Ligand binder design. Structure first.
Ligand code: EFO
Ligand code: PC1
Ligand code: PC1
Ligand code: PC1
Ligand code: PC1
Ligand code: PC1
Ligand code: CLR
Ligand code: CLR
Ligand code: CLR
Ligand code: ADP
Ligand code: NAG
Ligand code: ALF
Ligand code: MG
Ligand code: MG
Ligand code: NA
Ligand code: NA
Ligand code: NA
Ligand code: NA
Lengths: 994, 303, 34
């Protein structure tokens, strides 16, 4: 069951109109298109091809979301019961305390400050991220007035004709005029992403079902088609749907998942304590109202309010950093994921390479020939007249399907812009500069049928009409994968005359490829066949879906090789990447020779490791004799992968260090990625072509080249390198690694405080001594040291070991693990707690009660009536008088915690390096330290702080009581991290490196 | 890689499962031991540093005098009947309704029996008239266990008796007994003629620290009672010759000055609030501490 | 001023408020370092 009925309701078309009918309706010539004039006219009449902006949310309502943001809302609950319990206080007693009044005031205040802070941060994210929503002007290719040109999709109007190819997004609702083997992705409209064919035929009365309408907001997977705009902008079927054509979507990143898992349990234990203390308090003769406030104080104390804001900041940071690197990131949480990368599976051409080809050598007549590679100012290095070079140049011309854009024929061939294959462009520009016009050549051999190139066939082919005299009336022409091309041949053309393909020439063919491919040039093979007359008469009906014509016994003519240099950054890019523990695997559809060559040139493969073919060659022994494991690197041809079991594919991954996958089908790109996933890795795919679609989707992270990319593949990805700068991947990965460290650092710090926040009340019972720390003071601990200092960590800069340490294990380095609880609870949490206890005993013993004396006093110390409380010196204390000291103890305990919270916030600044390597450059951390302590002085040395919050001044000696412990923390972690810097794999590391 | 790590486990049985090697969802008995030990020596030596640093502080206090006193600075006034909620409510005719009040007050006054102040070494005879501060010396171990200024049951007029087992105390019209809080090294200063009291300065400006029990506060109050102050020398206050106090270390059996107030009113079957007050220069009061230098006892002789 | 025994909290309190102003102000000056 669906809603497709409630979509076919408002539908009316012209999928029924004949071609002549169509023509007169819109007026456009079905083959030259519409005049730029008539275009410009319509555009002012109908407005740009763009859906009108759908308002998602308003400002102020987003503000309140943040204000009640998960933890924020829990705070209100407590704040409510605080005002609540205070109203009750003015009814059980005459003029009661001012504690709970002020407590409600502070608590609420924090929610506000926190809330409106996070809001403004998160607003800044969705300001910067949207600054990129309009940086990729979706181009469309139109044939206005004879020539064809690529414009902003917004300039496309009703009527003109569009040309979509493989992996192009469909720019408006079209009526297909013509099509060769076109397949469209209607997934966005009809669920199933299975390619649907588009022909010009009329196939179903329903506009949706029929095959001759391509819809706006879909894309065509592959094949090629021309069609005529029948719906611009909001008028298209997909503009008409008032749901969400572009904006909000799904997906839940692993880092998000980790966080949500942790918050679920940390909030659980935090309420387990609150109500266990709550009932414990009741048993301990706690008043009813102050029991619930003690509970609610506890909850807030074992619940990390910072986390959310901290996370928000970190995203806002990373969003600002990628922006300055022209890296469009669709979900900021995935930048994390990008850090956890163990394997980068990249494409060759248009990824590692610049995709700026220029023809350099030809193989024909058993010779190699050079053609002027840069600043040609001539034509090649052979006679332009050779019979062989002729027939070669013709099919490299004819079987080519690239053409210069509109209004170019007045400037140099190198200057004008092209449309189509970077390989074909090079083909074009070449022969255009040294032989003749391909425009006139193509028009002389009017093409009848063709099967346009696609990444899985690895050849293009067409039949053209021949107007020569030796013409047998039909000229078959194809190019592709040279190996593949040659394998369909029978004869080879030599000095004009074709003679059978003997074994020698085959081997010369191979040395040629080894030679030319070895320079790192891309090689293309070229052949043709003169279709024989008696078998193929004048009006012959060539069929191109059942192959009515020969695919075998062709006549091989030559190879042309083109230079395609590695992109600027790629070496240091894969360099640094490998040095970060990231395995870099080349996955290309190109030839193994050309593949390997670039592999070494960028350092996918380090010249020093050998391939079994290298090894075998070295010893002059069979290759199938070598022992695979003697090879650190390998070059796996996809025609052999086709015969791999998973275990075999798994094996080549598991046991080779530098892997290269050559001549891979698009699905084979997936399998590989799928294989690397299966091992327990986290893969990153970087592509550009439409053939990288499936792999970019499967991938743990897609990265598209934002320029040389295709529509579809940019859409698959999570990142689009707008500058086509491959080094953005590094920047990105480092950035990712950073979010994880900083976020973990935050949880490390924020969790220490819980133990001292709760050990007093526990000890209050187990030793029956005066409560060292109470409800009022607990909040202070929390909202004073576990807030601003926790957030500050997000602002904390990068360590120095990140791009030198192995990528994290998702099944070990969880954001929170036992090791992190080992520290924050078992080690550092404990110390901080002793610090408070120490100062507690000093204050009492200095004031008359030695620690040993303190056992038992609980019942009577808290008792409101015994005013003869005898200390160790035998002095007699009244109720409120010993409470003054107890509550002066509370103030100190808190203050002591602040002190140790410095050292903790310093060691939780770094996880590996020392704090002398890292260095105080996080000003926001410093800022936290001072304000945190000014607050501490303030809460104790302000008038009426003991009348309002039971907080009294300290004597100067008190402050230093906790100093010893604070230092013990700094140095313990310092030496701990030192042992780990100098003992990797060490027991120290394998237990305390949280 | 060829390195074997991660958790590609397919058994939630591993919670306890161990047929392979590791156990209790943990590691092996070699690391399940090793880390246990870590914490053993960690917490162990950590507890030592708490121990150690507590020790250092300890030798920064003299076991003769508290390093701080400003929090007990002015002393408070406390009675000996264990005030329920500052309230002494009972049914005069029935013995049961106050037997509690009696056992408390009787137990305390067994520290002051004549048979308890036997030996002349520990106990000294301070005159039968309130004198000036018998200054034992310097708060050290120089002079040993200082002498204890004795105090006889008989000074407390009418609230001493001499029965068999338990003291026969006041059933009709009760006996409240007031006491001063022991501050180590304290010397009471009785009021002169300037900052006078809520009442006419009863004699002994030199050596007695006055205590006067009126009704509820001083303003418009239902004053219905008959006060009667019993004490040493028959003066309504405290004998200065007992101070200063030299701590539990130097005065183990020190008996502090007592002073009773047999309340023999003229109104049964009702609760009345009565505020006692020790006046002086060394005595202070607090609006929050209802006991600091003063008293708010509410008694009900409802028969 | 001085007499029998007690602790001057007047100076301890004003001395601590002077500090609370140092920490507070230096704290802001760092986070706004031009
Ligand atoms: C940044 C925008 C925030 C959305 C704000 C919406 C405010 C409206 C308001 C009406 C809420 O819906 C709410 C008050 O009803 C609400 O939060 C409830 C669902 C919630 O159950 C509430 C009643 C609670 O009692 C709550 C305190 C829970 O007890 C507690 C276990 C969860 C707290 C928590 O921090 O959850 C976050 C947070 C809600 C966040 C919320 C984030 O949701 C969770 C959402 C999803 C992802 C995975 C995040 C991770 C990270 C991106 O924040 O984890 C998610 C992990
Ligand atoms: C009894 C207990 C009482 C305790 C009360 C404590 C209240 C704390 C409540 C939550 C605080 C959460 C705020 C997160 C920290 C933001 C850091 C940041 O860099 O801000 C700029 C960023 C700007 O974006 P930015 O971070 O990208 O730019 C930074 C540039 N420099 C380096 C120059 C600063 O955001 C803000 O503009 C938002 C404003 C929020 C500020 C909140 C102040 C806290 C209030 C009082 C706390 C105590 C100290 C007193 C001093 C007051 C003056 C500051
Ligand atoms: C009135 C009530 C009494 C008040 C007293 C208050 C004292 C309470 C103190 C705290 C208790 C909280 C327990 C710790 C929480 C840990 C949970 C967690 O998330 O771990 C999951 C994780 C799960 O991780 P996992 O999901 O990845 O699973 C791993 C396993 N494989 C790989 C096979 C899937 O568990 C662990 O591995 C950790 C093991 C810890 C060892 C034992 C845990 C429990 C022991 C102590 C509890 C005692 C109960 C006290 C209550 C008494 C009440 C009367
Ligand atoms: C009255 C008694 C008072 C006692 C006070 C005790 C205070 C201690 C509080 C509990 C500490 C644990 C906090 C939970 C934090 C959860 C964070 C989270 O993300 O979890 C994921 C993490 C996941 O990490 P992980 O992914 O590495 O875990 C799986 C890995 N393997 C398979 C190798 C195990 O889970 C944790 O590690 C949970 C920690 C458990 C540690 C056990 C603590 C023991 C509890 C205290 C003593 C018990 C006494 C019982 C006797 C009762 C008699 C009176
Ligand atoms: C490898 C790195 C090492 C670093 C270099 C080595 C530095 C020198 C070593 C020690 C430094 C001093 C501390 C140890 C002394 C212990 C004190 C003690 O006994 O405490 C109990 C005493 C108790 O003495 P008491 O027994 O007489 O009791 C009465 C005192 N009152 C009434 C005040 C309670 O406590 C105090 O009185 C101390 C508090 C005073 C106020 C301020 C103290 C700060 C002084 C330290 C600064 C360090 C110098 C460096 C310069 C810094 C300038 C920015
Ligand atoms: C009263 C006591 C006051 C003590 C306060 C002083 C702070 C230190 C306290 C405890 C000592 C621990 C410090 C070790 C820090 C490690 C730094 C490091 O990795 O160096 C290489 C770093 C890094 O060099 P790198 O950048 O070339 O990288 C190499 C790193 N390794 C070598 C690990 C592979 O060098 C430095 O940056 C130099 C600065 C650090 C020097 C430390 C200054 C003071 C610390 C020592 C004084 C205390 C005496 C020790 C006794 C303690 C017992 C009380
Ligand atoms: C209030 C006081 C008494 C609570 C004391 C809690 C102590 C016992 C708790 C707090 C944190 C705990 C540690 C937390 C994490 C680990 C890692 C695990 O692999 C071994 C158990 C161990 C080491 C736990 C042992 C007990 C532990 C140290
Ligand atoms: C290098 C290391 C070994 C030196 C050790 C010094 C330790 C013992 C010092 C450093 C700071 C000191 C504390 C600093 C302040 C106070 C307050 C005082 O009222 C009690 C003593 C006490 C608690 C001191 C006890 C000794 C102390 C903890
Ligand atoms: C190494 C760095 C982190 C140590 C910082 C130590 C600082 C914060 C210490 C050293 C001296 C301390 C001050 C020392 C004396 C007084 C007077 C007292 O009436 C109020 C507290 C106050 C004002 C103390 C606040 C904390 C203080 C300023
Ligand atoms: N326009 C084209 N026409 C014919 N053959 C082509 C064309 N483009 C590429 N080929 C050949 O087919 C191979 C398949 O390439 P593909 O599968 O897309 O990956 P890559 O683009 O990296 O080569 C190419 O390496 C080349 O040999
Ligand atoms: C019952 C009893 O003994 N009452 C006595 C009374 O005899 C004595 O005259 C008076 C002196 O103040 O004290 C009271
Ligand atoms: F450029 Al490729 F497969 F190497 F698309
Ligand atoms: Mg490509
Ligand atoms: Mg390609
Ligand atoms: Na908290
Ligand atoms: Na994915
Ligand atoms: Na902390
Ligand atoms: Na906390």
């Amino acid at each position: 069951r669906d809603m497709d009925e409630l979509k076919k309701e408002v539908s009316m078309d012209d999928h029924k109109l004949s071609l002549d009918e169509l023509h007169r309706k819109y007026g456009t010539d079905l083959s030259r298109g519409l005049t730029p004039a008539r275009a410009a006219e319509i555009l002012a009449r109908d407005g740009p091809n763009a859906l009108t902006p759908p308002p998602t949310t308003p400002e102020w309502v987003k503000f309140c979301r943040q204000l009640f943001g998960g933890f924020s809302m829990l705070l209100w609950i407590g704040a409510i019961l605080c005002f609540l319990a205070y109203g009750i206080q003015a009814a059980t007693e005459e003029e009661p305390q001012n504690d709970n009044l002020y407590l409600g005031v502070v608590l609420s205040a924090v929610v506000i400050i926190t809330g409106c802070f996070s809001y403004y941060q998160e607003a800044k994210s969705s300001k910067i991220m949207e600054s990129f929503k309009n940086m990729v002007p979706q181009q469309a290719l139109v044939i206005r007035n004879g020539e064809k040109m690529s414009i902003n999709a917004e300039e496309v109007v009703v009527g003109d004709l569009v040309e979509v190819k493989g992996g192009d997004r469909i720019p408006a609702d079209l009526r297909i005029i013509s099509a060769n083997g076109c397949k469209v992705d209607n997934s966005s409209l009809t669920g199933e992403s299975e390619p649907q064919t588009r022909s010009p035929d009329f196939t179903n009365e329903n506009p949706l079902e029929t095959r001759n309408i391509a819809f706006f907001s879909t894309n065509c997977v592959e094949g090629t088609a021309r069609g005529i705009v029948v719906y611009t902008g909001d008028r298209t079927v997909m503009g008409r749907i008032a749901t969400l054509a572009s904006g909000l979507e799904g997906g839940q990143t692993p880092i998000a998942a980790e966080i949500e898992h942790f918050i679920h349990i940390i909030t659980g234990v935090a309420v387990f304590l609150g109500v266990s203390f709550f009932i414990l308090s009741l048993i301990l003769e706690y008043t009813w109202l102050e029991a619930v406030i003690f509970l609610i104080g506890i909850i807030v104390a074992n619940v990390p309010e910072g986390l959310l804001a901290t996370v928000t900041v970190c995203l806002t940071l990373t969003a600002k950093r990628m922006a300055r690197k022209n890296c469009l990131v669709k979900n900021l949480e995935a930048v994390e994921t990008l850090g956890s990368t163990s394997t980068i599976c990249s494409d060759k051409t248009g990824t590692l390479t610049q995709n700026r080809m220029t023809v350099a050598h030809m193989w024909f007549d058993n010779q190699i020939h050079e053609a002027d590679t840069t600043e040609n100012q001539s034509g090649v290095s052979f006679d332009k007249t050779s019979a062989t070079w002729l027939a070669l140049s013709r099919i490299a011309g004819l079987c080519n399907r690239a053409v210069f854009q509109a209004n170019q024929e007045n400037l140099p061939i190198l200057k004008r812009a092209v449309a189509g294959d970077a390989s074909e462009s090079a083909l074009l520009k070449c022969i255009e500069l040294c032989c003749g016009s391909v425009k006139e050549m193509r028009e002389r051999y009017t093409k009848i049928v063709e099967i346009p190139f696609n990444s899985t066939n690895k050849y293009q082919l067409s039949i053209h009409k021949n107007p020569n005299t030796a013409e047998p009336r039909h000229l078959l022409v194809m190019k592709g994968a040279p190996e593949r091309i040659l394998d369909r041949c029978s004869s080879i053309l030599i000095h004009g005359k074709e003679q059978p393909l003997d074994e020698e020439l085959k081997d010369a063919f191979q040395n040629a490829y080894l030679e030319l491919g070895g320079l790192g040039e891309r090689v293309l093979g070229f052949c043709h066949l003169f279709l024989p007359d008696e078998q193929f008469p004048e009006g012959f009906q060539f069929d191109t879906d059942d192959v009515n014509f020969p695919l075998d016994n062709l006549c091989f003519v030559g190879l042309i090789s083109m230079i395609d240099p590695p992109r600027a950054a790629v070496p240091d890019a894969v360099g640094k990447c490998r040095s970060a523990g990231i395995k870099v695997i080349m996955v290309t559809g190109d030839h193994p020779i050309t593949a390997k060559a670039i592999a070494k040139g960028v350092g996918i493969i380090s010249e020093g490791n050998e391939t079994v073919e290298d090894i075998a060659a070295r010893l002059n022994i069979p290759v199938s004799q070598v022992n695979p494991r003697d090879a650190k690197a390998c070059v796996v041809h996809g025609s052999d992968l086709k015969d791999m079991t998973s275990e075999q594919l798994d094996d080549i991954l598991k046991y080779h260090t530098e892997i290269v996958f050559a001549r891979t089908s698009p699905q084979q790109k997936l399998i590989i990625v799928e294989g690397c996933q299966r091992q327990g890795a986290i893969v990153a795919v970087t592509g550009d072509g439409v053939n990288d679609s499936p792999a970019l989707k499967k991938a743990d992270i897609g990265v598209a080249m934002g320029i040389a990319g295709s529509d579809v593949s940019k859409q698959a990805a999570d990142m689009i390198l707008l500058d086509d700068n491959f080094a953005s991947i590094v920047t990105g990965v480092e950035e990712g690694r950073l979010i994880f460290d900083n976020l973990k650092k935050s949880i490390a710090y924020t969790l220490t405080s819980n133990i001292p926040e709760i050990t007093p009340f526990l000890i209050f019972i187990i030793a029956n001594i005066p409560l060292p720390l109470g409800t009022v003071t607990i909040l202070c601990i929390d909202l004073g040291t576990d807030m601003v200092p926790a957030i500050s960590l997000a602002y904390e800069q990068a360590e120095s070991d990140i791009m030198k340490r192995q990528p994290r294990n998702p099944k070990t380095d969880k954001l929170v693990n036992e090791r992190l609880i080992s520290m924050a609870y078992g080690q550092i949490g404990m110390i901080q707690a002793l610090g408070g206890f120490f100062t507690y005993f000093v204050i009492l013993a200095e004031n008359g009660f030695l620690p040993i004396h303190l056992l038992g006093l609980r019942v009577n110390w808290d008792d409101r009536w015994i005013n003869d409380v005898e200390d160790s010196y035998g002095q007699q204390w009244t109720y409120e008088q010993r409470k003054i000291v107890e509550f002066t103890c509370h103030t100190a305990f808190f203050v002591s915690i602040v002190v140790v919270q410095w050292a903790d916030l310093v060691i939780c600044k770094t996880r590996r390096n020392s704090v002398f390597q890292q260095g105080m450059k996080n000003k926001i951390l410093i800022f936290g330290l001072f304000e945190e302590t000014a607050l501490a002085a303030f809460l104790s040395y302000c008038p009426g702080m003991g009348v309002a919050l039971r907080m009294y001044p300290l004597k100067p000696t008190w402050w230093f009581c906790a100093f010893p412990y604070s230092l013990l923390i700094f140095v313990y972690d310092e030496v701990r991290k030192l042992i780990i810097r100098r003992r990797p794999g060490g027991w120290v590391e394998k237990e305390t490196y949280y | 890689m060829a390195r074997g790590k991660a958790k590609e486990e397919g058994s939630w049985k591993k919670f306890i499962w161990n047929s392979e090697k590791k156990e209790f969802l943990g590691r092996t008995g070699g690391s399940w031991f090793k880390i246990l030990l870590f914490y053993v020596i960690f917490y162990g030596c950590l507890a030592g540093i708490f121990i150690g640093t507590i020790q250092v502080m300890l030798l920064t206090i003299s076991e003769f005098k508290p390093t701080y006193q400003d929090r007990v600075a002015p002393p408070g006034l406390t009675q000996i009947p264990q005030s329920q909620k500052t309230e002494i409510s009972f049914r005069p005719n029935d013995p049961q309704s106050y037997e509690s009040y009696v056992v408390s007050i009787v137990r305390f006054l067994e520290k002051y029996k004549d048979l308890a102040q036997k030996d002349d070494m520990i106990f000294e005879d301070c005159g039968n008239v309130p004198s000036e501060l018998k200054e034992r010396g310097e708060y050290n171990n120089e002079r040993g266990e200082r002498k204890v200024c004795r105090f006889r049951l008989e000074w407390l007029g009418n609230c001493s008796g001499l029965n068999d087992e338990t003291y026969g105390y006041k059933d009709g019209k009760p006996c409240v007994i007031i006491k001063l809080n022991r501050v180590l090294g304290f010397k009471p200063k009785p009021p002169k003629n300037e900052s006078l009291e809520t009442y006419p300065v009863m004699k002994y400006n030199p050596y007695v620290l006055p205590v006067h029990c009126t009704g509820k506060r001083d303003e418009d109050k239902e004053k219905v009672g008959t006060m009667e102050y019993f004490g040493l020398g028959g003066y309504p206050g405290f004998p200065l010759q007992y101070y200063p106090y030299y701590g539990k270390l130097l005065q183990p059996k020190y008996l502090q000055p007592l002073m009773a107030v047999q309340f023999t009113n003229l109104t049964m079957d009702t609760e009345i609030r009565i505020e006692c007050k020790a006046y002086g220069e060394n005595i202070g009061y607090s609006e929050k501490d209802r006991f600091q230098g003063r008293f708010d006892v509410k008694i009900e002789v409802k028969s | 001023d001085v007499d029998p025994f007690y602790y001057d909290y007047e100076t301890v309190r004003n001395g601590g408020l002077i500090f609370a102003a140092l920490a507070f102000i230096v704290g802001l000056i760092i986070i706004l370092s031009k």
